[PDB]
């Protein structure tokens, strides 16, 4: 394995990851904004053979006055043939460390209700469910708008 900063040229080689229905494919403005504003929150893993196992992309925001200064996880995906290796745990730990270095307060992320495996693995990681939001996922193709779970975890500053 090899962890490095995400770059624009990698956008032409990560197609073997987004083909999973559970993963999205945002537009050019989204990726450009996330890369320019928060370059340090964009990590990609490269295999010895030249493939990409997965990537983690996030951001930080909030108000320090109300202790809302927190890190947020936007996307996190792993290739189907590179799972069961703890890569997601390593990426999450790296994001937690980099958010702690910035003096945050907590970390949060959204998740699909039906995605049972992700919820179980997050719960195993010490993450505690915060609340539930109704019809967050704007489903297309006639599918019902699935709700989302607001997932949260504390930090060490508090």
């Amino acid at each position: 394995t090899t962890l490095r900063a995400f770059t624009c040229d990698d956008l032409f080689r990560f197609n073997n990851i987004n083909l999973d229905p559970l993963t999205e494919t945002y537009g050019i403005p989204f990726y450009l904004q996330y890369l320019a504003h928060w370059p340090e929150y964009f990590i990609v893993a490269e295999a010895p053979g030249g493939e990409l196992m997965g990537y983690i992309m996030g951001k930080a925001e909030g108000s320090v006055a109300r202790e809302e200064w927190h890190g947020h996880v936007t996307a996190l995906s792993v290739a189907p043939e590179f799972r069961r290796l703890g890569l997601a745990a390593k990426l999450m730990e790296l994001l937690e460390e980099i958010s702690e270095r910035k003096g945050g307060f907590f970390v949060d992320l959204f998740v699909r209700v039906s995605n049972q495996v992700a919820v179980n693995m997050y719960k195993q990681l010490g993450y505690s469910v915060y609340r539930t939001v109704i019809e967050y996922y704007s489903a297309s193709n006639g599918e019902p708008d699935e709700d989302a779970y607001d997932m949260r975890k504390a930090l060490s500053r508090d």
Binding site: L22, T23, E24, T25, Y26, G27, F30, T74, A75, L76, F110, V111, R112, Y136, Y137, S138
Partner: peptide, 5 residues
Amino acid sequence: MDVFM
């Protein structure tokens, strides 16, 4: 994951 927007 978030919504596409």
